[PDB]
């Protein structure tokens, strides 16, 4: 479940570093800079070539990695996105970020993924008034990811706050460090709040 | 015998448009009048007539030849990309509303035979009427 353990050891697996374990995975190493290439005795030989299906697959897996989830719910909601009569892939991308774990991550209140999920699980977060636990929670345009009253009185949360005050929100999710909160709006995309991937590749391998 | 003379007609479309001959010689009927009527009307064929050969009422159709293309051989681009005989003496296919084909998903063109004579795909589409399906071209 969510891998857990030698996490950003798998950051050299992609060959690419990520905001994954937070602190020790951005600044001078995602376990990177020290050594960036696929783990194991076999890492820096003289690689070959991944077939189209394989590389596109790779891309899909990378997607499930940065979001840190079993491809279960993932894939299911993907075809759910194909159900929505709009351009399947992109619509899917917006409705892909929309999950509150890494949403609250890039919203600020979390350093790492593991963190965000752990916190929301413990009833540490309340969107639009109701305190829950479900991190796999999509949110509609106009909500209010407020934080718990004891979670404002906690410490590393404040650490996450102040180690942020100077970052432009994803132009919709306003940060209320006034009493620890986040105001939710609209629907961005792969052009608004992008990331270094090609979506329709993933899409193209996906359904064959 | 030609119980399917229409088939013979579009047949000579393939023939004459392949061999590239100014205009082809053929027989006549009211249906085929309506046919080349729409055929020329939707800017496809060039002509048709009501002349006589050997004292018999023969129809003759001109063809539409676009710009003279080159390449490893001339072969002027032919407006007759291809035709097709639909309501074969066996498949008396009937059609009306969204029963309308597309042909090239948008463009293309077809023709039909209803109680309202010989119509076309987009035309009978607006019409909100239908009858029987007979031929197609692009």
């Amino acid at each position: 479940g969510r891998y857990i353990g030698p996490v950003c050891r798998l950051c050299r697996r992609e060959g690419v570093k990520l905001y994954l374990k937070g602190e020790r995975c951005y600044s001078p190493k995602c376990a990177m800079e020290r050594r960036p290439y696929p783990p194991g005795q076999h890492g820096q030989k003289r690689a070959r070539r991944p077939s189209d299906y394989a590389v596109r697959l790779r891309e899909k897996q990378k997607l499930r990695r940065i979001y840190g989830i079993s491809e279960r719910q993932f894939r299911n909601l993907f075809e759910e996105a194909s159900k929505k009569k709009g351009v399947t892939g992109s619509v899917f991308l917006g409705l892909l970020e929309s999950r509150l774990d890494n949403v609250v991550y890039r919203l600020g209140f979390a350093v790492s993924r593991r963190q965000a999920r752990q916190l929301v699980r413990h009833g540490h977060i309340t969107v639009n008034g109701r305190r829950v636990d479900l991190p796999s929670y999509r949110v509609r345009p106009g909500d209010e990811i407020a934080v718990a009253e004891k979670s404002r009185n906690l410490e590393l949360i404040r650490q996450n706050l102040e180690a942020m005050k100077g970052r432009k929100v994803g132009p919709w999710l306003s940060l209320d460090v006034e009493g620890m909160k986040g105001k939710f709006l609209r629907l961005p995309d792969r052009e608004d709040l992008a990331l270094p991937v090609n979506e329709q590749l993933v899409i193209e391998f996906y359904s064959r | 015998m030609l119980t399917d003379p229409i088939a013979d007609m579009l047949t000579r479309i393939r023939n004459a448009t392949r061999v590239y001959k100014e205009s082809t010689d053929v027989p006549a009927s009211r249906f085929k009048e309506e046919i080349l009527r729409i055929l020329a009307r939707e800017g496809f064929i060039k002509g048709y007539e009501r002349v006589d050969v050997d004292g018999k009422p023969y129809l003759r159709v001109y063809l539409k030849y676009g710009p003279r293309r080159q390449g490893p051989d001339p072969r002027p681009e032919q407006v007759i990309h291809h035709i097709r005989r639909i309501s074969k003496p066996g498949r008396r296919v009937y059609v009306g509303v969204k029963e309308i084909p597309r042909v090239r998903r948008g463009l293309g063109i077809a023709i039909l035979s209803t109680s309202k004579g010989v119509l076309t795909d987009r035309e009978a589409r607006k019409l909100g009427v239908g009858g029987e399906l007979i031929c197609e071209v692009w």
Binding site: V87, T88, Q200, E204 | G106
Partner: protein, 151 residues
């Protein structure tokens, strides 16, 4: 300055009272990523020779397509020999989807979304040729007009 991209190779061989001498071939396509595409059938003794030379024969056997809205116009089918390929335009939310080589050349073309199936004989070569000519038969409303307006 284009995008030099390959497809596959061929190991051609035959025997004699001097051994069983081979011969080699390269299947390459030059593609400016988005626009003009070109197939290159290179036949030669040595391998990298055939590679670069099939690249340049791709630089010679050229074509392009009406890259109409990240896809193609009408919807068509083309057979060479006994092998045939199938085609219909698709808006975004579908993507470039076909067999290996088809999608390959379609990326040498810059396609974004297109329905394309394959039927009949399933041999790489004939398939590729069918591709090229099918490319040469993609129109527009404009090309529609020259023919459907009269001369």
């Amino acid at each position: 300055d284009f995008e030099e991209k390959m497809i596959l190779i061929r190991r051609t061989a035959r025997m004699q009272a001097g051994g069983r001498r081979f011969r080699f071939g390269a299947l390459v396509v030059v593609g400016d990523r988005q626009g003009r595409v070109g197939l290159g059938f290179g036949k030669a003794p040595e391998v990298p020779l055939a590679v670069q030379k099939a690249g340049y024969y791709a630089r010679r056997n050229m074509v392009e397509v009406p890259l109409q809205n990240g896809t193609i116009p009408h919807e068509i089918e083309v057979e060479f020999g006994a092998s045939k390929i199938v085609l219909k335009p698709a808006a975004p939310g579908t993507g470039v989807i076909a067999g290996a080589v088809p999608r390959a050349i379609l990326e040498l073309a810059g396609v974004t979304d297109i329905l394309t199936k394959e039927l009949g004989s399933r041999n790489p070569i004939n398939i590729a040729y069918a591709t090229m000519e099918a490319l040469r038969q993609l129109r527009t409303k404009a090309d529609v007009e020259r023919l459907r307006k009269g001369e």
